[model samples]
Target: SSERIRYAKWMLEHGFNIIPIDPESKKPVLKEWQKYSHEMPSDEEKQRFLKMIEEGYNYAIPGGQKGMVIMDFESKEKLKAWIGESALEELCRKTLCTNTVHGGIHIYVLSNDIPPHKINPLFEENGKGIIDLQSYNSYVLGLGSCVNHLHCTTDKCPWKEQNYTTCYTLYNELKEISKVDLKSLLRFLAEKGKRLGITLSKTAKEWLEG
Candidate 1:
């Protein structure tokens, strides 16, 4: 659709890395997406991309571009559940976001200072799973693509104009917080936790012990 093409170009202009995907199946049109994952499409390449979109191809954005990290929830209810929690509320509010095909949403943030991590819904060892966080080595279906017969929408996307942020920036701003800030810093804080052979915590109070 024209909407997807326009959005893809707009994202490209805004420093997002995009790739063509099958509209209905949500599969990549290209066999190898990583080869072009970091490069912004050239003018000639843009023409080809636009043509694919015009022919019904969708779009996807690779992770690790400018520290892009997307929290992919399986449902809107799950997203709300996470946001309702104290540790994640502010993070969700400050970043960019978009609706997903299965009535979920993608919350975008920058995890540049933190290693890639994910909460595999099917097998969360700790049982605190809410989303699959796409970082360093993952990819997300771009906003405006169709999946499960539903179209992704940015009509109410908060980050449509808001800037991206780094985990360091968030940590610096939140470290002094007396609330649940520490738990939010687990990825960065725990980078050194294992070096000392201590486990990372899920809550602020638990982190206090480690």
Candidate 2:
């Protein structure tokens, strides 16, 4: 329970771009996190982040890092409704997924040049909103972070660790059935980045392979 620093260091060593956040608000402490998007922290900076973890601040990875995208479903029911059974099985079979602190799920996948998107409810009466497609500029709490006092962990989490895979492999299969072509996807993201004046890191671009 008190190993949040250990978790933070593990993620950092794995080449993830992480930042410290206010445990209550879940907002990052850095004034401009995008500056670190194309770069990882130095050893000194990482040590400072570990200090923050020791001081009770949680850590999160920016969605833009290494072509990462998180599909945050607010509830299992909504997720089943949105992606359906076969797709759910495929997702679970092919990528990293975790149950959120709340009664929801986080489907982590990799993509090349996909911008952050969201899907709100189609009707007001429905409690199903906030189907977040988190990428680029957005952030997700890494493992061991707590939200509203509930901690995110793998203990008793339904998803098996061995089945978890990165999105890079999943994307290859999705490209066949998906309407979105990789070329167009890359083009759209390129224009979006141009408009925002953002440059992708070499590591991000090469995430699918060495």
Candidate 3:
């Protein structure tokens, strides 16, 4: 009832907002959930969201919040291998990011001129996967006390190793979100991609960190 209240409210400070989500389906349980997209939560909506957090479900940010781009990795180990150590440290410190229950990470960035969305396994499948570009039209789980229902089924999800009940770790204080240009954003990622002998991006990636 108490653990998630803090981060649950933290969302309201930023332009983003959330809806109650069923852990099993990872989808919203509320009726007419799409209403959350165009506007901020009403007083009742906000109250209900906090109430649900005390129970079985976690909450997620509705997509269509323009300038919100999340850089998500499937594996912390692979991300550690893919990016340089010093750069990773700066990335973690400079803005808001989260350590997920699944051992992956979510880096929040503010951007615009969205092009291609969700870039995972950037090159080809069966090789090491890439940072998934989760932007508009994507819902991200909140960074508060939460649990992944499938996390216990380790045999099926061998990559995710953790306890059933977990709290998402914020690597840094909510100083600010990462602000970067769309072209420049992928240039950093693409240069890193090229460093790994991989490909790049071709989209207008202008965005701001708030």
TM-score per candidate: 0.60, 0.59, 0.76
- TM-score of candidate 1 relative to the true fold: 0.60
In lDDT terms, how accurate is model 1?
0.53
Ranking the candidates on TM-score from highest down gives: 3, 1, 2
Lowest summed lDDT window (length 10), candidate 2: 168-177
lDDT of 1 at 132: 61
- Deviation in angstroms for 41 in model 1? 3.4
Clashes of 2: 1
* Order of quality (lDDT): 3, 2, 1
Question: Candidate 2: lDDT of 63?
Answer: 75
lDDT of 1 by residue, 22-73 (tens): 7555676666666554566677877787788767677778776766666565
Candidate 3 on 65-173: residue-level lDDT in tens?
Answer: 6566677776666666556677777777776788776677878777665544444443322454445666656667777757744446554354455545666777556
Question: Taking the tens digit of each residue's C-alpha lDDT, what string does model 2 give over 137-174?
Answer: 77777666654423324654433344332211122222
Q: Quote model 3's TM-score.
A: 0.76
Q: Tell me, by lDDT, which candidate is best.
A: 3
Please give the lDDT score for candidate 3: 0.64
User: Which segments of model 3 are wrong by more than 4 Å?
Assistant: 1-3, 23-25, 31-35, 116-128, 148-156, 159-163, 201-210
